[PDB]
């Protein structure tokens, strides 16, 4: 009588905030947590969730659509019921909760648009992941609809940085100077975009525009504060759960996108 | 025989840092990691810890040195062994693993104070958790020590947020505008902070100096990057597994793993 959950990463702010909530909402319903960690390997997740599997736990939760086939067929044969949080369903029998990113890189950059900041590049992390190809694809259509081009972005497959942020930005306005907004997929790349501005005495908005992907408290506070797209990792904690139990028995996230300073 | 493990927060550095090379090192000795959360919970930390001890033996590690009358016994109870990471550690024979966040307060602050920078306020959360309380005491430690009169302090029983440093900047400015440099408990904090001088149009360092208290890589590439204490997490992750190892492996041991201040222009003098 209880669920288990394995986490892809720490640093993940989704996770950060849904963790809590889920088990809590879970735990009010009857069911315990016994969750695994499987620092973004496939390999990891199955040896973990193998191991769980040895006591029958009838609800089991993961994340992203990516898992070897060598354990798909273990939770789709000891048939205990699965939520994926990921855009993709991998067996589409089981759950799913998933956020649209493309439409989250979409509205980001639209709205820098129809604010008369039309010369937009684009910093990314963590790329290599599906959701930052997305974003990125959203960016770039937010820009085509508008008869502009999509020349001027920058990516890494590690993970998110203040350091990224800041070298990117030197790394964009050295090829073109007349960059005058900044998409950013994580508010650490964000924020070291925030303090080169300061460094380069480069007024935000006025000189530069700047919105993040995946905000939070953080850059809430910063200054010229951040205007970010911003998701409810708890409303999610909470709202799996209740699909896991009224699943058990019985028988599309958006986001606000806050407003805020470096935009006026 | 498995090996369990009860994670605090999701949001610590020390967590966030450690868990992963304690994932690695434990796997190459080949043991699978049972975990669990509790929002700092003694109490959830029963209910869990419970399930796990029901379940394999092995060891189990720990992290604070506050528990519950039910843990102290099933754990002792059980005769398994248990790795607090914690400075001291309760029930004598437990294994432990902790820095001692006192020297770290002190050092960081006698450098404010070796800098020419007197009259350092301090800001700093989660201070009803031992380790603020510690980092405070070593701050006001530095202060005395030196006839300087240390009650410029902020702490809240939440949790670090730029938020926080913002206002807490603002706070004491307003107790007392002669304040010139910070001690902050936490990254976020100090971030916050800068981001405030930077509204305010104070200068930094030469208007105020700031020090955070548990730097990473956000700070170290702030502007101006800013002086801090760095710990290294991942290390203290393969060190608790191999303590841990070592004990079901049996020889027992002290453990005097300390930080770097990192000196940046937050506190510099020219």
Same mark, same amino acid.
């Given at each position: 009588?209880?669920?288990?959950?394995?986490?892809?990463?720490?640093?993940?702010?989704?996770?950060?905030?849904?963790?809590?909530?889920?088990? #809590?909402? !879970?735990?009010?319903?009857?069911?315990?947590?016994?969750?695994?960690?499987?620092?973004?390997?496939?390999?990891?997740?199955?040896? !973990? $969730?193998?191991?769980?599997?040895?006591?029958?736990?009838?609800? +089991? +939760?993961?994340?992203?659509?990516?898992?070897?086939?060598?354990?798909?067929?273990?939770?789709?044969?000891?048939?205990?019921?699965?939520?994926?949080?990921?855009?993709?369903?991998?067996?589409?029998?089981?759950?799913?909760?998933?956020?649209?990113?493309?439409?989250?890189?979409?509205?980001? =950059?639209?709205?820098?648009?129809?604010?008369?900041?039309?010369? +937009?590049?684009?910093?990314?992390?963590?790329?290599?992941?599906?959701?930052?190809?997305? #974003?990125?694809?959203?960016?770039?259509?937010?820009?085509?609809?508008?008869?502009?081009?999509?020349?001027?972005?920058? =990516? =890494?497959?590690?993970?998110?940085?203040?350091?990224?942020?800041?070298?990117? $930005?030197?790394?964009?306005?050295?090829?073109?100077?007349?960059?005058?907004?900044?998409?950013?997929?994580?508010?650490?790349?964000?924020?070291?975009?925030?303090?080169?501005?300061?460094?380069?005495?480069?007024?935000?908005?006025?000189?530069?525009?700047?919105?993040?992907?995946?905000?939070?408290?953080?850059?809430?506070?910063?200054?010229?504060?951040?205007?970010?797209?911003?998701?409810?990792?708890?409303?999610?904690?909470?709202?799996?759960?209740?699909?896991?139990?009224?699943?058990?028995?019985?028988?599309?996230?958006?986001?606000? !996108?806050?407003?805020?300073?470096? =935009?006026?």
């Amino acid at each position: 009588y209880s669920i288990a959950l394995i986490i892809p990463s720490l640093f993940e702010k989704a996770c950060a905030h849904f963790l809590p909530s889920f088990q #809590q909402a !879970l735990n009010k319903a009857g069911y315990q947590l016994l969750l695994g960690y499987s620092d973004y390997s496939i390999e990891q997740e199955e040896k !973990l $969730l193998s191991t769980f599997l040895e006591s029958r736990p009838a609800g +089991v +939760v993961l994340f992203g659509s990516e898992h070897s086939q060598r354990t798909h067929q273990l939770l789709e044969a000891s048939n205990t019921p699965v939520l994926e949080i990921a855009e993709l369903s991998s067996k589409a029998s089981y759950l799913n909760i998933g956020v649209d990113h493309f439409e989250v890189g979409k509205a980001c =950059t639209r709205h820098l648009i129809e604010q008369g900041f039309k010369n +937009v590049g684009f910093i990314g992390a963590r790329g290599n992941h599906s959701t930052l190809q997305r #974003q990125l694809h959203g960016w770039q259509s937010a820009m085509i609809e508008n008869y502009l081009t999509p020349d001027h972005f920058l =990516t =890494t497959h590690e993970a998110p940085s203040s350091q990224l942020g800041a070298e990117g $930005l030197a790394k964009l306005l050295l090829r073109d100077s007349s960059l005058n907004a900044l998409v950013c997929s994580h508010e650490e790349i964000a924020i070291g975009a925030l303090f080169e501005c300061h460094r380069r005495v480069l007024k935000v908005p006025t000189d530069i525009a700047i919105i993040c992907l995946e905000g939070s408290s953080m850059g809430e506070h910063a200054y010229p504060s951040l205007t970010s797209a911003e998701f409810d990792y708890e409303r999610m904690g909470t709202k799996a759960a209740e699909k896991l139990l009224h699943a058990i028995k019985g028988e599309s996230m958006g986001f606000k !996108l806050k407003r805020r300073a470096s =935009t006026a």
